[model samples]
Target: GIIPKKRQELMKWNGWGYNDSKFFLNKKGQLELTGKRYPLSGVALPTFKDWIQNTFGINLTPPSIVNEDFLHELKKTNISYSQEADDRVFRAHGHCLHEIFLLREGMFERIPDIVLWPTCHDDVVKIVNLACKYNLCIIPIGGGTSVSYGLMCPADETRTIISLDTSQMNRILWVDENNLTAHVEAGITGQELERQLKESGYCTGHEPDSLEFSTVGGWISTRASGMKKNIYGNIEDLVVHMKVVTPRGVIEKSCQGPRMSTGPDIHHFIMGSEGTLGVITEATIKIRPTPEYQKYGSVAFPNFEQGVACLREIAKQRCAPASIRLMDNQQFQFGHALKPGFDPNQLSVATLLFEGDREKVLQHEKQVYDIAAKFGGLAAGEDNGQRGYLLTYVIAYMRDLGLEYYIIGESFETSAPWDRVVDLCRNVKERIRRECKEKGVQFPPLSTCRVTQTYDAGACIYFYFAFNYRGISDPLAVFEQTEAAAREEILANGGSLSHHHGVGKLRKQWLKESISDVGFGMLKSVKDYVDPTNIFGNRNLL
Candidate 1:
């Protein structure tokens, strides 16, 4: 199915992806599918029962009332909607661990009054206009896979809320083979779009881990980065133009020239806007011919610093591979555990992928290998590289595993200059430990980091942490306090607010700090101009 029909029945309503799929463990019976034991730092993270019992204290019931009046009026607009509790609850939160826990405990504080599916551009405009007229808050949901709070509802209960689902608006609009570009409706999921393009021998080359479920609008809203960003560039780079339906009117950039000097590029205003500006309806984006060949390889470095140096050298030489990811010692060991037979003592690992012309891929492989050798990178074969990529999607299931064992685990990512990468990693990890202690938590949390993307001047680092709340009365509050401290340390140590993840409700507090007060204020001014009544409020960027 393109989009699951009986979503509540067929999908893991409280967690990730499909209901029937999960990452299975090896013969050892540990949660690790790789069969290698990564050092856990002896930190005791919470079990599912620990979090559920401590956080919610008791099972919760669904909302007793919904805005039936609003639904009746919306139905009058000739749009499709469902007032079923299952539909409304399924559209409530995103795929984040915070959302998972809340859903698992039935603490849906702000579930939508109804879920509406708008099938066209005019439908979106009409919905926004209706929202403004009725003083309703419209939360635009695409694939519903946001990790940074992009799908969170408003806190206001006095006003009607609509989960404006755009899945049915999916269409490939058109493809300009000569220009190597395509116009696509924002509702199309990445996998479906790729399937559509593949038939025409074209590909967007955007493969975020969430690609299976994330839509074009969600990608544009978050300024998303694909796994092959080194070759295809991020969403901001691939998107040439977009169409946004604001409260005031539609803002569409139809011009598709290579470059323009027309004031400032309004495309950016929507790229990372995170839906606070308006609902992105469609986009014209760069695409490429499907690669004819693909290859994978891996290298092991003596230490994390050496691996970083090797990547820096590769980037400086402008020979970045299609996909290059370096996992720290902890991740490397964990990877070994996931696979049944692998040595855990093989230092840190860096995976590589080259796709496109066979000759060019071979040449790239040679060049990257030479650079790796300069930094003492020993070839570890391609098995690890292929496994690493496969694990990318499977790892999301870890949150479910963590919860099954009573652990509250989640991940956060940021970017920092080469000069500050080492310190940022160390300080943020230490900050997590220190904050957990200061908060009087009995268990020490486990924190691990990896370099997912690297630029000539900087790199993106992703951190994963988990902890148990044995003695903590309010686990959520304690986790928030610790994460806040960690973010403070990251910025103080030279990290950006975020790399690919946009500033949703979770990271809004640091928005002004990342971009100066004047910059944030200027954004607010634009929001005021486009959505004066704030009808498109999704608690995103602004």
Candidate 2:
């Protein structure tokens, strides 16, 4: 009937050969499958190979298809599916389980028929072309940051899934500290790239929460937003050029000089196009030098209005406080408890840090302090040091601790006229609290996001949530409950589903239902023009 928990975990990780006859159901009347043989007349269990072909349409019957070498390659890459039941469960979810699947008895897992490791641009193209010939659907897997349906293989069994893994394409092609420009492969993770750049005395903006694991290409496709986006800028601004491979041909562009333009900028079309456009190979980006000296401070306010006011003043004054973050009273309290010494009596706190040459940093600090004083803000030293370390160095610290994260809660982001920013944050907080109470449940977990990016248009507000998973029999159902609520809230307030993360699968349905008929139609036309066969990404139902 169901698989055991440990086995299920393995299956979820896609570990191979664990689902064999080694384990059998003990008087549980449940049998998902574990390489065991039992008595069941008229119940012909389809062979594993048959299941793969049926599930993904990838031909697995040919002797050449299921050889030892092929199996070896499959076991090596993270994209390759494991034969374990948990792997099957994970694959089944493919970023859209809204709820967790329970493994109660036997295990069920299926791996990709073969694994393709593309070390270079041409290699990626070759894999795509090969999949085209085999009539297989290629699932381009990167860093596994897909928290939505981007990775899921449709239940259509006729289509085989070709996992095009590009982990091997990781490399720092070139560096130009002078011009503040750099070349990097898409698979080069955020942390890896940052470390290399830091060592070379440079930096880039866009600090995603999953900086340690997320890749450049993933960020590009997802339209990722990171911490301090206001200053460093969002992915769109950081990304100057990209190289991609499509069914038609190889597409490449160069982002030379600080800026330019003659005709319409084609680069706009591909920047956040997601995997639907093509597999991104590499990128040229703007980078910065590491700050020489830095100073940090924190101050609490009686209300969000005061706190946001302090931030607005900083932005208005054009002060480059290297890192500035404002936290909600609740999240501030929660974060306070996790640290050794933080007073929770403060309603809302603002943390500001400045980095540069010693003279410049100190000068900026003085200016920031004057502004803080203007708004009745206190200068906190060690009391706020914890906050600075958490925001700035936490990524490296987590990587050292070998942390695997699950943002398994509900969150949304939005932007509004600068004047409306403070109220927007307040309204969202109140709405979430009221909504949870109405459901007869305590608030699960909470995090804070600020007006990351600012332009003449508006300021972006990022909201976050974290909660312990509710062990329900149906995981998909759990996801739907929270997502449905976020959906309603975001749209009602005139906010888009995501400030940075692209529509991928999690927000795909809303793209159609929420977008205007004309806008959606244009997107469809773009899809038709670029991916005529819908051979690239999942293409959702769009």
Candidate 3:
């Protein structure tokens, strides 16, 4: 599934530099074509495992599986997204909507040995067996919606990557109204599956803000939470049963049947395992019936703190709005101005939407509105209207603007203690200002807002930072400095380094210093028990 030229380029970038002639001459530094090239310790450098073993360390290469047919198909599949190369940098100028896929090569990056389009349980099993035999590093990729570090393709030549892409394996096997359950292929998109389920008047309540972009497997694997999590809940609460393909074997477990005695709810362990444990092929998910009535209104508060208080009261009292989001005052002021006509400057806006059997939904909306009035907030009174559609489509409009400005939009979302949530937001805002000033750049009222908040235990803080790309000359350095500066406050306040996003290579590099040694060891032990081979995803996680 690869173009030969691109494949060769991938090999060279993956430490297979010998493909280029002047092999001995370059070793002696005679024909310095690239200039100042050094043999890297491993994957980062243009040196293979054998060379690294001879020069620095022992052999640490993963086994490989060669699927000629599968690999060939992957070359032409959705290898490319709809966005530009530089535009998709982790935290750059896009709407934080699209998936950023990349490889280190002249053009062709580390192409998987073969791409497996497994459509059913049997196919997944066959692919897993091939992985064990060939020693291929299996990379289970879905809709690639991860903005975090998990989806990174291994550039190591020794480890031939077998990307099990399930994008085309979209199929809805069955739906039951009585049980309120839906069985579907893991590759199905939320929208596509929702459309099919609509036939039965059912929907997945756990709608991610990025529902239009991400996938069922992608969301479940990442243990993702969503904008309307208060009502619909996260992937963990919705998944009732699953069928996974592991290097060890196939795992088909059910959370249905309402059984009492189980060891530790192993179904959950697989839900958020991040695909390191196995490749989840299909799932029997808990579904929700279409609400008889739904109402939405935007409530404006004086400041973010009061907004948080209002939301906390709503949650504590179980008002249970279908869609409730509180945008900090800064987000309303600056973000609205940045993307006008959508989020107008109305101080702090908390959108409260309710849904249920018509009468119930109206009651909930009225009760919530009464609570808002008590807090001196104004209700927009526009419910079940254009607001929901606007909420979904606003980011796309901003992304269109990004293409014009050559600006890259990067978002980092994490939760912190309630006591430090406010402070953390302030500190991040101040740090961004300080960094921009020192760099002779304008911060221009960037958005540092809380997307979701609960009791001090934890809250999701979504912050944005951007800069124009100045080639590769200093982009990495600038981003590193910026992330380091913002992280100072986040780490100090006992906030999770990653709340919404998983710890990828770049983020995990600093994890040693971020988490305690004991905590790190626990993760290692978990990997040891379930995935000793480390072939499921990458060994870096261990």
Candidate 4:
């Protein structure tokens, strides 16, 4: 579990990636990556650094961790917890822009009073039982990678916040090969789970960008989607059962049938609960036999419109190469600039990943390119295809690096019907650009988006907006305002609130239109009934 050993010890305490991996200036003042985990590790790329710097340049916490007596209740249960500033601060903030901005210079009034690591389902039971007894805030953090600000402590919260980190409870409880399922503890990270499965010749195939740091609990809690969702299904489809211990009682199903229709199917409540409900202890998820073959391919379209149409038709036909991501010309150029050598002037590029048996992989490749060819597509080879897909994990670290250079970059996503996809992308980008004009954003600002996921009805449009702040006071506020304006345009033009990023605290203001008061009433009522003392007090939703 990358719920690792006091992560701040090995990884960057206040940033996105490892202390060794981020883009830092070398002794010679050259840009280089020092870590060995990433693709560009241990390499110097002055040109790549210069290009991004020239393109658009750049962009916490709190409280004393806790007093020794703070663990009075926890010690009674012998549950382990960390009171260090490093652990407390790391557990508090997600990768949200404001949190990162706060990380560089500012401070969080409250991080976490203490970070507790529950080892088993029983440990969680005891912790919550006492946490409830004392009216402490419990926010379960796995990788703490939330961009939706789901993990941040409420600035206004009055309760003593307890970071109920689930790292220690990271064990594969059981594997039912006969049923093609694995019952895994909540804290088992994606990489850890995948590694274990690989050794057993099976794979769950939930490939979120945060796979290295994200956990099964997070995938379930966030109701996240992955690049390979077309073939493996989203986290929702993969999870069959869960064990959530709330202050009120345990929410678990007796039967693990393929599908069940009864009352509300509490799984619905658990999937997107965003830690407002309870602590996820363990979950039963479906798995697949390892794919026999893997292939990579990339396609270039003459224009964005044609590229979108190609993806649309591909999804409509219900045929995708396991995973397919179409990047707009703008993002393509940006990615090209980062890696360099690709002709940035070219049109959009769709990174294609294919896995499964030999024949099926080949057959789908033909079907996809054929569909793409109908819309002015040309093959762009495997290297570009694979490289682009791998960058999904690497790009996030840049957000942290941007802080050093005063550049701010982050991505948000929304889904819209095919009829509105083109318009939403165009209008949202325009709205962001317009907002930049109103703000004191430095030159050549960036507002780019990519169609990251495709569906029968629509596609997920992931957006990236970056700018250089000319020491604008409250730069965080400007960033929020610009994104807010884009979200306004996004909603007005027909996009859903979010495609996969669960509606956490950050997007709650827009929750009324997205879910309506009726939906919120049901959730709030459930919360009131279960957590009357507000034990789970991160306050993610209404």
lDDT for each of the candidates? 0.80, 0.58, 0.58, 0.83
- C-alpha displacement of 483 in model 4, angstroms? 0.7
> Model 2: which ten-residue window has the lowest total lDDT?
395-404
Report backbone clashes per prediction. Answer: 14, 30, 20, 7
Query: Which regions in candidate 1 have their CA more than 4 angstroms from the true location?
Result: 23-73, 341-346, 440-443, 470-472
Candidate 2 deviant stretches above 4 angstroms: 1-114, 254-257, 341-346, 382-385, 388-408, 442-456, 466-479, 513-515
* 11-59 per-residue lDDT for model 3 (tens digits): 2322212233212224532212232222211112123223323322223
Candidate No. with top lDDT: 4
Ranking by TM-score: 4, 1, 3, 2
- Record all residue pairs in model 4 with backbone atoms less than 3 Å apart, i.e. clashing: 58-406, 58-407, 59-403, 59-406, 59-407, 60-103, 61-108
lDDT of 2 by residue, 222-252 (tens): 7788765655777888987788887777777
Candidate 4 whole-model C-alpha lDDT, 0 to 1: 0.83
- Output the number of the TM-score-best candidate: 4
Candidate 1 per-residue C-alpha lDDT over 1-542 given as tens digits, one digit per residue, 9 for 90 to 100: 25753476767778887766554433433333321222221112223223333332322134534455655677787898876778888888887777887899857677777688888898998888778767888888888888888888866655677788988889999999999999999999999999989999999999998887899999988889999998898998898888899988989765789789989988888778887878899888899999999999999998888888998898899899899988887777666554422344437789988999999999889989989999888888888787677677676766776676556878899999999987888889889988888887776677778899999889999998778666778877888778878888888999999898777888887888778999999899999999888777776876
Clashes in predicted model 4: 7
What's the lDDT for residue 524 in model 4? 87
Q: What's the CA RMSD for each of the models? A: 5.7, 13.0, 14.4, 2.6
Whole-structure CA lDDT of model 1: 0.80
- TM-score-wise, the better of 2 and 4 is 4
Q: Worst ten-residue run, lDDT, model 3?
A: 87-96
TM-score of each: 0.90, 0.74, 0.75, 0.95
Q: Model 3 shows how many backbone clashes?
A: 20
